[PDB]
Amino acid sequence: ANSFLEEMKKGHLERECMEETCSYEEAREVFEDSDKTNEFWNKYKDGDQCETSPCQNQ
């Protein structure tokens, strides 16, 4: 999660953010930006919304 030494390095999107609670922060240092962190994080509280293909006609 956010243990000691652990976060004395760099995050890994398989190591931490999946099998762990992946609160955020460590979910954000892997990219260090805004482009992918939001979308990526949105799918772990309850899942991804574009799985269902809700919108019509592209």
The residues of the shown chain that bind Ca ion, judged by CB under 5 A, are 6, 10-11, 14-16, 25-26, 29
> How far apart are the C-alpha atoms of 16 and 20, rounded to whole Å?
5
Closest CA to 40 of 16, 5, 56: 16
Closer residue to Ca ion in complex, CB, 12/56: 12
Kindly tell me which residue out of 25, 36, 44, 50 binds other proteins, with binding defined by CB under 8 A: 25
> How far apart are the C-alpha atoms of 56 and 34, rounded to whole Å?
27
If one asks whether residue 7 binds other proteins (CB under 8 A), the answer comes out as: yes
Residues that bind other proteins (CB under 8 A): 3-5, 7-8, 25
